[PDB]
Structures are given as structure tokens and as C-alpha cells.
Design a protein around this ligand. Structure first.
Ligand SMILES: CC(C)C[C@H](NC(=O)[C@@H](O)CC(=O)O)C(=O)NCCCCNC(N)=[NH2+]
Ligand SMILES: [Ca+2]
Ligand SMILES: [Cl-]
Ligand SMILES: [Cl-]
Ligand SMILES: [Cl-]
Length: 223
């Protein structure tokens, strides 16, 4: 997160870190046994880490649980990042508490202007590199589909939306991949891609989760 603030310990209790020896992606806990992340986060040897603030310090609210199954979207295209969504089933159900909580799926798509909370352990610098160990948060508006497609001609699908600031300075970055975009208690977005980070006229592109709610519920009910 570039130009955000320290969330505060366990203030985003639905935020997970995907760990393969190191944090490599964020994700959202949607029930005791299932995480939503990005398809581009896909890999084997995933441990889901819940109740985390400093990912380098054991602070005592952690739950570490192995993925048993990863389901990348049937239509995920890695060339274009269309349908950049993946489900992860835990080997065992998480113990749900004040620090380890599920976030509701959208009943409907959000519109432009809707304010949203974006969170992650990603890069905090728009030039060079700095990785925080504590969860960073950013308040960002959903942008018009028109200004999104103008920012990234030919690259924005109806399965994508832009959020952030065209003036730049505030954005997600690498390490926030697969993480949450929450608007009015609903998970509407997944950190997917962008040209650089917090750059002028290069807003964050997010997977449009409202498009995936039937596939998510159906897949969870069959798995
Ligand atoms: C290519 C896929 C597999 C990974 C993806 N890559 C990118 O976003 C950049 O390489 C694209 C670019 O033009 O710099 C990535 O790192 N995405 C996660 C965070 C994206 C956040 N970027 C924002 N908001 N500017
Ligand atoms: Ca920790
Ligand atoms: Cl509900
Ligand atoms: Cl910072
Ligand atoms: Cl489309």
C-alpha cells in the first residue's frame, strides 16, 4: 500500500496472508474453510495465515492452516488477467473470533464514487522498495468505468474496475496481490494489477467480485 496508514492490529480480521516460506499474496476469509484471492496468486505449498498483523512476529492471535484445495477461475486468462479470482479451501476450519472473521460477499455490484477499504502487506513506495511487516490500509473511491478504460486502453474487461486517485500518491502495490477491496461490508474487489504503483493516471485495477458470487457460492457448496 502506497500513501496509506497502519490499519492497527487485527482491525481487518478478514485479511489473510498467503505464505509459501514468506508472505507472497493477500486474501479474504469468506467463511471458516474458504479464502478468496487472485488467480495470479496461484501456486502450491500455500499456508493460509489468519489473525496476523506483523507477519514477521508471532503476536498470539495467529492461525496457520494449510490449503487442501486451490480452484482458479475456469476462465482465468494470465495474459490479460481477465477473471483474476481463486478460491482456497483450508485443510481444517479456522476458529472464528474477533480477530479471525469472514467478510460478506456482495449481493450487488458497487458503483463509481463508492468509498472502499484496501489493505495489504505490499510495497509502500511508488519509486524503489519498502515492505512493512504490519498491515497497511487505504481509503479509495471506485472510479468511473470510462476513466478506468481511458487510463488503460484495451486492457479493462467488465470483470475489472479501477479504484484510487488519478492524481496518484495512493494505491495498492506488489505484495497486496489477491487482497481485499471492501465497500459497505462487502468484498467487491481483489488486488489484481496496475502500471507501477500510485503513479499519475495509473489507478489500481481490481477483480470485480459481484460478477463471481454465483460461481463462489456454487463452488463452496460443491467442494
Ligand atoms: C503481472 C501480474 C501477474 C502481477 C501484477 N503486475 C503488475 O501489476 C505490474 O507488473 C504491471 C505494470 O505495468 O507495472 C501485480 O503485481 N499485481 C498485484 C498488485 C498490483 C497493484 N498495482 C497498482 N495498484 N498500481
Ligand atoms: Ca504475526
Ligand atoms: Cl451474510
Ligand atoms: Cl507508509
Ligand atoms: Cl468483457
Amino acid at each position: 500500500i502506497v500513501g496509506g496508514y497502519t490499519c492497527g492490529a487485527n482491525t481487518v480480521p478478514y485479511q489473510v496472508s498467503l505464505n509459501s516460506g514468506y508472505h507472497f499474496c493477500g486474501g479474504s476469509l469468506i467463511n471458516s474453510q474458504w479464502v478468496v484471492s487472485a488467480a495470479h496468486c496461484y501456486k502450491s505449498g500455500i499456508q493460509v495465515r489468519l489473525g496476523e498483523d506483523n507477519i514477521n512476529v508471532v503476536e498470539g492471535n495467529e492461525q496457520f492452516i494449510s490449503a487442501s484445495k486451490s480452484i482458479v477461475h475456469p476462465s482465468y486468462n494470465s495474459n490479460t488477467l481477465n477473471n483474476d479470482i481463486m478460491l482456497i479451501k483450508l485443510k481444517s476450519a479456522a476458529s472464528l473470533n474477533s480477530r479471525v472473521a469472514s467478510i460478506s460477499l456482495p449481493t450487488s455490484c458497487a458503483s463509481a464514487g463508492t468509498q472502499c477499504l484496501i489493505s495489504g502487506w505490499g510495497n509502500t513506495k511508488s519509486s524503489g522498495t519498502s515492505y512493512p511487516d504490519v498491515l497497511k490500509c487505504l481509503k479509495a473511491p471506485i472510479l468511473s468505468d470510462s476513466s478506468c478504460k481511458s487510463a488503460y486502453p484495451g486492457q479493462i474487461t467488465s470483470n475489472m474496475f479501477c479504484a484510487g486517485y488519478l492524481e496518484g500518491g495512493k494505491d495498492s502495490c506488489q505484495g497486496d496481490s489477491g487482497g481485499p477491496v471492501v465497500c459497505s461490508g462487502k468484498l467487491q474487489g481483489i488486488v489484481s494489477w496496475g502500471s507501477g504503483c500510485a503513479q499519475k493516471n495509473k489507478p489500481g485495477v481490481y477483480t470485480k467480485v459481484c460478477n463471481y458470487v454465483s460461481w463462489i457460492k456454487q463452488t463452496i457448496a460443491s467442494n
